[PDB]
């Protein structure tokens, strides 16, 4: 049993995390009360990766829910699968973090973090063989961003030999709550550069544009964005949750995907993306082409603007593996220039027989592309436009931060951008 411990923090983190557990619970045949009602042994074979077994053959998510205000976790608890979570794994304060990284990381978050670590330890202690951790959060707010990265640092201190994986929602001016999001995101990215092994970068503008342009949703909601993210998270974790050879655990995945320690930020993608023709059969060739289509990717970065260091592709459903191999080989052989030539055979493909609910087949894309630098450049530009005038800084210096820490975060992310550029030219 290679247990993963899941953590979800702040508003974004808990809303997406709740949807994620809804989605994979349905895949494993777990109902809202933790009872199993599936019809396939494939569903239970690796169920212990994400679920603990309670008395009465109940399955309980190995999940810790964290926030600095009670509202979103109240909603989670009142939601569809809200009763499936362990009540003691709800850890929350009352004062909130005010969309402020400093409040999350240094003041409000600091008061709460030990109680979170106590629950993390309790979950880790019962693991037969802990793989590591996966955190869901946004980078643009205060709790997920500031307290989330505080958590990651303390977890690394207590579990230095375990893998740390995040699903990190990057802010965009187009789908924005506050003007200080670029401050919060820049502060957090430096934390992630040092303390995660794998980070899936989800850009809210990409999510919005997929909903509006491709799915024809006239007025996308956070709820719509979150179902996209949930479907993607289900796809990217398929290899962890079902029998398989490739990327079957967090460490083997990292060894395959991360050739240089700092360059561990992935662009995920999902297919099919279909507007409400929705009954039309999908072919492997069509899955493959859409999976690699920039329009199906979620970092708002143009892959043709860079090069792939490594790629993992996961196909789900009953389909010809012969055709999958053929189609995957075709994509690499016909656009070979976008794959760095100094990492031979850097595209790995996995197939899982169980498709997502309500689909005959689907495909999920994980790319380690140097084009991700565009995302960090955007954040850096927005950061500097304000910081050059020290605008909105008083929210942070009021929590004890000084300007030098912002200067260092800025330099750190520009270093990261430079590091991507050198391998794009290599």
């Amino acid at each position: 049993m290679r247990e993963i411990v899941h953590i979800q923090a702040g508003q974004c983190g808990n809303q997406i995390g709740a949807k994620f557990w809804e989605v994979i619970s349905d895949e494993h045949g777990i109902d809202p009360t933790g009872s199993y009602h599936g019809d396939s042994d494939l569903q239970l074979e690796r169920i212990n990766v994400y679920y603990n077994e309670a008395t009465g053959n109940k399955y309980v998510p190995r999940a810790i829910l964290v926030d600095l205000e009670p509202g979103t976790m109240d909603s989670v608890r009142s939601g569809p699968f809200g009763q499936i979570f362990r009540p003691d794994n709800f850890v929350f304060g009352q004062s909130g973090a005010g969309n402020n990284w400093a409040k999350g990381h240094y003041t409000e978050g600091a008061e709460l973090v030990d109680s979170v670590l106590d629950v993390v330890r309790k979950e880790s202690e019962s693991c037969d063989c802990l793989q590591g951790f996966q955190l869901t959060h946004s980078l643009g707010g205060g709790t997920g961003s500031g307290m989330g990265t505080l958590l990651i640092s303390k977890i690394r201190e207590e579990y230095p030999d375990r893998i740390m994986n995040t699903f990190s929602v990057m802010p965009s001016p187009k789908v924005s709550d506050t003007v200080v999001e670029p401050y919060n995101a820049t502060l957090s990215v430096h934390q992630l550069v040092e303390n995660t092994d794998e980070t899936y970068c989800i850009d809210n503008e990409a999510l919005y544009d997929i909903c509006f342009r491709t799915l024809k949703l006239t007025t996308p909601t956070y709820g719509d964005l979150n179902h996209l993210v949930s479907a993607t998270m289900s796809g990217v974790t398929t290899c962890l949750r079902f029998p398989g050879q490739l990327n079957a655990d967090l460490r083997k995945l990292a060894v395959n995907m991360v050739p240089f320690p700092r360059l561990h930020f992935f662009m995920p993608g999902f297919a099919p993306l279909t507007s409400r023709q929705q009954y039309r059969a999908l072919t492997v060739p069509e899955l493959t082409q859409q999976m690699f289509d920039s329009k199906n990717m979620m970092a708002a970065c143009d892959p043709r603007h860079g090069r792939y260091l490594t790629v993992a592709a996961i196909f789900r459903g009953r389909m010809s593996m012969k055709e999958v191999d053929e189609q995957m080989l075709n994509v690499q052989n016909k656009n070979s220039s976008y794959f760095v030539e100094w990492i031979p055979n850097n595209v790995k493909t996995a197939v899982c027989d169980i498709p997502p609910r309500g689909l005959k087949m689907s495909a999920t894309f994980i790319g380690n592309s140097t084009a991700i630098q565009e995302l960090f450049k955007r954040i850096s530009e927005q950061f500097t436009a304000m910081f050059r005038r020290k605008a909105f800084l008083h929210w942070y210096t009021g929590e004890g931060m000084d300007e030098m820490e912002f200067t260092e975060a800025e330099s750190n992310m520009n270093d990261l951008v430079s590091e991507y550029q050198q391998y794009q030219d290599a």
Binding site: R251, K252, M321, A426
Partner: protein, 441 residues
């Protein structure tokens, strides 16, 4: 009679091991419960099959084998499988978390903690042997355990069993079925540290087996199960001489004597024919001349390469089934007049031939058809160096950028071990070239 101990390391080693022991039981008339009706000496004996099987007082025939893996799920198959009664718990060794496709993790970090347990279990087997010959070691190049723990184990076996022969069966990495981008690193690191500890190694390229299964068994997308059943057939041909009455390759020492005049150059090429589909409704049976001629086709080799552009140091033909010497010599004469077969000047141009009258055994309900006669050719040809060139090129591509190197250094390995290993391979390639080889116009 002198005993041989088989050691199966990591997923590839273990699963190939389970395929081989299954086939051995079928060949020797041993049931899944270990009983062997044809063995009239209950509870002991020194027959040729006793080289691979010991005997309990209850008449159980138990493989002289240890299975080792750093994660438990593959060996849990063996504990749980058809031949579970064959083995006792002390023969199966598992850790809790694997080497993550990382040679350094397998060799240094985890290997350090499990190596003494493994040697203890091996010692227990050796204490049952009146005259231990040495070891047959099965593993992948590409896995962290298959690469890293095997090289550690091989070093310690040279220390604890200095006079004993060690043969390898090694799975060379193929991207069509591979699970890690770093397998070229692992392959070259393990080859470097194992080189001086191995007397003879049979490399099997997954690419070759994969393509034989697709082409000759009509399997669209071969599984490890398909691959391993074919690999076990070749392994069985190679070890049959140790397990049956005969006068060729009857002990491990003879493998080196017959196939390896140059110690570092200890990688014979295996070629096997015929491979026929069991679903093939109508099959014309192949003659001694036809299966022998097939031994000189790259399409039938365990490693794709071109022996026409290399030189032979030694050649062994191992037949199973309806074959007499007269027909072998007639086939060889013809083949020499048609094929490119150059031996090095300091070796004789000839063939050592073994015939076992019992035709190949096939797993009931398997992919392979029963045939009247089959042959495995073992030739030490410099052409196999093509596989080292391929591997070394991929290694160079990644190492020039230090891609993935931090994973290894992070486990305590020094970066210098990379260049040291690669320098050793460069010399190996040069050795093959010295043995093998002599615009605007």
């Amino acid at each position: 009679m002198r005993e041989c101990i088989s050691i199966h390391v990591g997923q590839a080693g273990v699963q190939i091991g389970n395929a081989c022991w299954e086939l051995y039981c079928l060949e020797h008339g041993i049931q899944p419960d270990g009983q062997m009706p044809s063995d009239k000496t209950i509870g002991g004996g020194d027959d040729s099959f006793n080289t691979f099987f010991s005997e309990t007082g209850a008449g159980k025939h138990v493989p002289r084998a240890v299975f080792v893996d750093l994660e438990p799920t593959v060996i849990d198959e063996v504990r749980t499988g058809t031949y579970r009664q064959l083995f006792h718990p002390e023969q199966l060794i598992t850790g809790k978390e694997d080497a993550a496709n990382n040679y350094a993790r397998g060799h240094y970090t985890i290997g350090k903690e499990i190596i003494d347990l493994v040697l203890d279990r091996i010692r227990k087997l050796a204490d049952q042997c009146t005259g231990l010959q040495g070891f047959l070691v099965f593993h992948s190049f590409g896995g962290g355990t298959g690469s890293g723990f095997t090289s550690l184990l091989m070093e310690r076996l040279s220390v604890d069993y200095g006079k004993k022969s060690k043969l390898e069966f090694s799975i060379y990495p193929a991207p069509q079925v591979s699970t890690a981008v770093v397998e070229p690193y692992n392959s070259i690191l393990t080859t470097h540290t194992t080189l001086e500890h191995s007397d003879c190694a049979f490399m099997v390229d997954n690419e070759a087996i994969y393509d034989i299964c697709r082409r000759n068994l009509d399997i669209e997308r071969p599984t490890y199960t398909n691959l391993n059943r074919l690999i076990s057939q070749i392994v069985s041909s190679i070890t049959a001489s140790l397990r049956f009455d005969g006068a060729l390759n009857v002990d491990l020492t003879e493998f080196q004597t017959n196939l390896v005049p140059y110690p570092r150059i200890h990688f014979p090429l295996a070629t096997y024919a015929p491979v026929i589909s069991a679903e093939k409704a109508y099959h014309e049976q192949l003659s001694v001349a036809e299966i022998t001629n097939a031994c000189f086709e790259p399409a039938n080799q365990m490693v794709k390469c071109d022996p026409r552009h290399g030189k032979y140091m030694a050649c062994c033909l191992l037949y199973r089934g309806d074959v007499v010497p007269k027909d072998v010599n007639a086939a060889i004469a013809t083949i020499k007049t048609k094929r490119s077969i150059q031996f090095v000047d300091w070796c004789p141009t000839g063939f050592k031939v073994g015939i076992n009258y019992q035709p190949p055994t096939v797993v009931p309900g398997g992919d392979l058809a029963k045939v009247q006669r089959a042959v495995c050719m073992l030739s030490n040809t410099t052409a196999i160096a093509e596989a080292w060139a391929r591997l070394d090129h991929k290694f160079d591509l990644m190492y020039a950028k230090r891609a993935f190197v931090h994973w290894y250094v992070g486990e305590g390995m020094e970066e210098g071990e990379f260049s040291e290993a690669r320098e050793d391979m460069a010399a190996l390639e040069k050795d093959y070239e010295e043995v093998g080889v002599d615009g605007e116009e």
